[model samples]
Each structure stands twice: as structure tokens, then as C-alpha cells.
Target: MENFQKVEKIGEGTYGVVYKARNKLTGEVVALKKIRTEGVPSTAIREISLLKELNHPNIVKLLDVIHTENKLYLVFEFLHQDLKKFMDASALTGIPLPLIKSYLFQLLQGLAFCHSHRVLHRDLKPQNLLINTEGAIKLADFGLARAFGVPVRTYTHEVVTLWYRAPEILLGCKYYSTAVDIWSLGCIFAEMVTRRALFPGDSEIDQLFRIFRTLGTPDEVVWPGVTSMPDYKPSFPKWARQDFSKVVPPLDEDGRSLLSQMLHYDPNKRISAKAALAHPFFQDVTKPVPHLRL
Candidate 1:
């Protein structure tokens, strides 16, 4: 641990203090995450186990895990900024089509790998996505994540960050799956393409309306038990006449198709990450873009 040169605190996290650190020997920068572990289930264990088994360009890197006394420390590759910071700095508002395609394709590739490994990155948001100097994206923060290959499941439906949360989750659906991640990906895609949040709702009702207004309300066929959701309630006047142009005005037909599929009201019907790789939006973008080395 002494090999690391401690720098200033970067930010506070769900379970730890994040600091900018550097290797004393090689001068390599890294993110030092100090997770608290006094009389609590181990967040570091979850983070280390999940990251050690998963590897993809858009996912964050876990370099090392160490324990001293009662505190656990996580070491990660240091990236220059996060998607939230990028959005703040980008004066262009909307991203160029090439960059948008490149980023989304990479994000899905990482998601595919995560689901295949039976891991659910329950929390997906732009702020947790890190971008290096080379523009490579890396998904961070696996503290709330869990392995999900069990026969039966039960957990909080309130998983994702508010802006990127799926309709089912917001509606209080308890037994969600990896499709939840896809919904967040759709939200991220719209944000990336437009340089602004598409569904920046202030409440659950407003959130559902935002979704209904953009993609139309879910019916029994598309979403069998949607009306029975714990928070089920209608807000839109003519739900079917939902406006796509208002939500994602610049999206072409292909973009809208992908967004709709990802944001499917029924989590079961949401497109798989593997299927998302073939999206036409990525037809002209590069493939197998490697993760940036810190």
C-alpha cells in the first residue's frame, strides 16, 4: 500500500471514500477506494469478486484489493473523468453520431459480458461510466451488484439511479433481471445523443408519463401485469399518441427502434445485450475497441 502516492479525494461513494492515487515506483495513477467494513456485509468482497471475474472495455478495472485492520481498500485504474463530467464540459450538447455509436456499442458489449457471467450491474448511470483520455468508457461501482443465477430471487426493485431506471423498476416490479441494465443503457444512449437527459422526471408518476409520452403506455400484451405494479397509476391523457420527437427529436428510425426495444415495459421482452450489438446505429462504427490502460 505504501507504493501508492496518495492524492486528493475525488468523491464520496455509496460505501467508501474515493481518492486519486499514484504508484510510487512507476508513477501510474489509480483510484483508491477505501470501503468501510465495521460490522457490515463486505462491499469490498462483492466489488472484488464481481470485477475479478468480469472484463470488458466499457467496464471499470479492479486492480487490487487489500485489507488492514477493519477497513478494506480497492484499487482501480484512474480515468480522467466520468460521463457526467464529460456532459458538463461538452459545449456541443449533442455528441457526434460516430462517437455516440462507438460509446453505446461498447457499453452493450460490456453488458453482454456481465450478464453472461450471471452478474447484474444493478446500478447503471452516466456518472458511474468513466472516460479516459482516449474516450474509452468504463463502468464503475459494483457495490450494489450481485450474482443472479439462482432459481428464485428477491431484492429491492429500487436498484438503478433515478434518471436511468427502467419503467418496471420505477413501477415497483420486484423481480427484475439483466434487462434492467438495458433500460438504463437506452436512457444513457438518449443522453449521449442529445447531450441532455431525455426523461428527467421529478417523480414516479412523472417518470412513467415521460416514458409513456415517449414510447407509449404498456398494455397487457406487451406487459401482462403492468397495471398491477405497486405504484401503477396513469398520468397521460392519450397514452398511445405519445410523442417521440419531443423526447428524442434527433433520433432516426433506427435509433428510436433500439431505444424502444431497450425501454420495453415488460422486462422479459427487453432485448438482450448480444442482440443489441447488431443495431444499425453501430453499423458504421469501429469494433473491439480496447479499454484504455491507465
Candidate 2:
């Protein structure tokens, strides 16, 4: 453990600190995640098991996992800036179409792989996506994730879920699955296009309305069984769906189509990550120029 000189603390939370460390002898740099362990967090175990098994260019790599006194440390390739910071840095240029396409494509490919393997990246906000020096999008933070193959299905509200949460989750639907991630992708897609959050709501009810204003409130007509959701309310205002072409003018029809499928209210009808690759939208994409903000 002494081989790594923990130089600086880059990130921290209730768990522990993410320190910037360097190999004293090898002269290599790595991002060190030091996690507190009572009996070791279940989330940490979840992340490690998946990271150890799943390997792909889009998925972040787990270089090392060391068990120390009362803490557990995981080592990873050092990529300082996250996608949230990257997008904020692009305030002036506003993420060129090519770069957006490239980044989204990478995310989809990674997500596709995860889905094919029956894993659900429950938390997929911009913060969890890392931008590498090579302009690649690497997915990180798998703590909230779990394998989809598990039989007992019960999803009420989690301990935390801010923006990027799907409608099903917000509406207290218990049968939510991979479609939750697709909803997040759609929200990110809109944010990438307009340089702002698509549905930046303050509360769960507010979020549903925000989405409803954009996509229109769903009923049996559009979204079957939406009323069956535990949180569904008849008093909810009826909103007429706005034109997607107007909501996101920059993205072409094909991109809008992909985005539409991604944000579809019905989880069963939502597009799968694997099927997304074949869309005509992927035919034309861009080269991302990756750089760390700090």
C-alpha cells in the first residue's frame, strides 16, 4: 500500500475519499477510491463484482482492489474530469454535433454491452461518465447497479435519485428495468443538444410534470397501465405534447427519432441499447476532442 503516494484528495463522499495517487517506483498515476468498511458496503461489492467481470472500451476498468485496516481501496486509470464538467467547459462551443454523437454512441455501446450481460446501471448521470484524454467516454460508478437477472422485483424509491431518473421510477412503478437507463440516456441526449437539463425538476412530482409538458401527460391512450402506477394521480394536469422538432431544433429527424424511442413513456416499447446501434442515426457521428477541465 505504501507503493502509492496518495498526493491529493480529488473526490469524497459518505463512503471515503477518492485520492490522486502515484506509483513511487513505476511512476504511474491512478485515481484511488478509498472506501470505508464496516463490513464493506454492499454497493462497493456490487461495483467490484461487475467491474471484475465486465470488460469493454466504454466501461471503466478496475485496476486494483486492496483491503486494508478498516478501508477498501480501488485503483483506476486517472481521468480527472467527468462528463458533467466536460459539458460545462463546453459552454461556449456547446458540444459540437459530431462530439455529441460520438459520446452518445460510446455510451450506447457500453450500455448495450451492460444490458446484454443482464446488468442494470441504475445510476447513469453525467457525473458517472468520465471523459478520457483520448476523447473517449468511460462509464464509472457502478455502486447502485445490479444484475437484471435477479427474480424478486421490488423498486419503490431508492435512497437517492436526482435528475436523470425515469418516469417509472418517479411514479413508483415496481417493475422498472433496463428502460430506466434508456430514459436517463434520453435526458442526457436532450441536455447535450440544448446545453441544459431537459427535465430539471425539483421534486418527483415536479419532474413528472416537467416531462409531461415536453412529451405530454400520458394516459391509457398513450401509455397503457400508467394509471396502475402507485404514484399516479388523476388530479395531474393534462398536458398536450409539444413538437420534438421545436423542443430540440438542432438535432435532425433521425436523432429525434432515436431520442423519442429512448424517452418513450412505455418501458416495454422503449428502444433497447442493442437495437439503437442499427438506427440510421449512428451512420453519421463525430470525433470527440477530450480534455480535462481541472
Which candidate ranks first by lDDT, i.e. highest?
A: 2
Instruction: Report the C-alpha lDDT of model 2 over 1-294, residue by residue, as the tens digit.
Output: 688875888766224567788988898998888765356655556656666778899988878777778678888877778888888898778888888889999999999998888878777888778887787898876644323233222333223445798988888876559888888988898888988888888877888899999999999987899998899999999999998898777888999999999999999999998898788998977666755656
Instruction: Looking at model 1, report the run of 10 residues with the lowest lDDT sum.
Output: 147-156
- Kindly give the number of clashing pairs for every candidate: 0, 0
- List candidate 1 stretches off by more than 4 Å: 1-3, 42-47, 143-161, 233-238, 287-294
Where is model 2 more than 4 Å wrong at Cα?
1-3, 13-16, 41-47, 145-161, 286-288, 291-294
Which residue pairs show collisions in model 1? Answer: none
Error of 2 at 234 (Å): 2.2
Candidate lDDT values, in order: 0.74, 0.80
What's the TM-score of every candidate structure?
0.83, 0.87
lDDT of 1 by residue, 159-213 (tens): 3346777888777776779998999889988887777887888776777777777
